Design a protein around this nucleic acid. Structure first.
Ligand SMILES: [Zn+2]
Ligand SMILES: [Zn+2]
Lengths: 160, 162
RNA sequence: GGCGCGCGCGCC
RNA sequence: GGCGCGCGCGCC
C-alpha cells in the first residue's frame, strides 16, 4: 500500500499521513490526533450559515509554521476534527522524490490513495484530543467558544 | 518561468509543452503544429449551440493512446486548433519532479505559468498543420465536414435573425 | 465550511 | 465548447 505525506503547499511542513484521512458524507477529515500540533486554531467570529447538530463548521485552521489558512475545524458527530482543504496540500509518496498537487479530492482518490468512510472507532480516537497541555487547552477554548456560539444560533433557529 | 509538460491525466501520454498554449478571448488553444499526432479527431454529429463564423466549436479530440476525451477542436479565424480541457490534463514540471491538476485554465495562469494572448504570428505555424500526411488529412476531413455543418446552421441563424 | 448538481446573463 | 459573473437545489 502506498502511503503519502500531506504537506503545506506553501512551506512544505508535514501535517499527517494519508492513512488518517477519512470521509464523513463527503467531508474529508483528519483522524490523527497528532495533527493538531501543526495547526493554529482561530475563531471566525461569525457562525456558519449551515446549522445542524451532527456537522458544525467552527474555527478556521492555519498552518502552524507559515500561518496560511489550510481549512476549517468542525464538530462532526460530537467530535472536534480538522478538515484540510485539498488546495492547501502537497502530497509526497513515502520514499519517492515526486510531489503532487490536486485540484479535487476525487483526483486524490483516483490517482494517489483510496479514502475510506470514517467509522465510529475513528471518531472515538479523536475525542478529547485537545487536553492536558497548555498548547492543547488554548485551542480547545477557541473551539469550545465557537461551538457554544453555533449551538446558540442552532437553538434559536429551532425555537420556531 | 518554468516549462511544463501537458499530459493525459488518464494514461500520462504527453501532448505538448506549456509554451504552446495561447488564449483567444479566454479559449486556451494549442499552437504546436505537432500536437495533432497525439490526438484522434472524432465528429460530434451535433452542431454547437454557439454559432459564429470566427470561433466554431467543432469535432471532439481524444487522447491518441487511451482515447479518453480530452477537449474539442475549434476553427478560430479560419484555422483549426485543439482546445485541451484542464480537466483531462496533468501538468508536469520535469526538473522539480512535480505534477499538478487544476480546476480551471485560470488557476494554471495563476499558479503555474504565464499564458499569452494569441497574435497573428501564432496562427501562421498552425495554418497547414493538417495538410501534410495521410493521417493528418483524415483529421482535416472530419473537421471540414463538421465546419460545413456548422456553417450551414449559422446561415439559418443569420438569416432569420434577419 | 465540504461534496455534488441546475438555471440565467456577458464576451469568444 | 471556453472563460467570467449571478441566482438557486440536494446530502452532510
Ligand atoms: Zn505552511
Ligand atoms: Zn491518454
Amino acid at each position: 500500500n502506498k502511503i503519502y505525506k500531506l504537506m503545506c503547499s506553501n512551506c512544505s511542513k508535514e501535517f499527517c499521513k494519508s492513512i488518517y484521512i477519512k470521509k464523513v458524507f463527503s467531508n474529508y477529515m483528519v483522524f490523527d490526533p497528532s495533527v493538531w500540533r501543526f495547526l493554529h486554531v482561530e475563531s471566525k467570529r461569525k457562525v456558519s450559515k449551515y446549522l445542524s447538530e451532527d456537522n458544525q463548521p467552527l474555527s478556521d485552521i492555519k498552518c502552524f509554521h507559515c500561518k496560511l489558512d489550510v481549512g476549517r475545524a468542525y464538530k462532526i458527530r460530537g467530535t472536534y476534527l480538522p478538515q484540510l482543504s485539498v488546495k492547501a496540500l502537497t502530497f509526497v509518496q513515502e520514499s519517492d522524490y515526486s510531489s503532487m498537487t490536486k485540484a479535487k479530492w476525487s483526483d486524490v482518490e483516483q490517482d494517489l490513495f483510496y479514502i475510506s468512510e470514517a467509522i465510529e472507532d475513528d471518531f472515538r480516537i479523536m475525542l478529547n484530543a485537545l487536553s492536558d497541555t497548555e498548547e492543547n487547552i488554548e485551542k480547545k477554548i477557541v473551539l469550545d467558544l465557537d461551538s457554544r456560539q453555533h449551538n446558540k444560533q442552532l437553538e434559536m433557529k429551532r425555537f420556531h
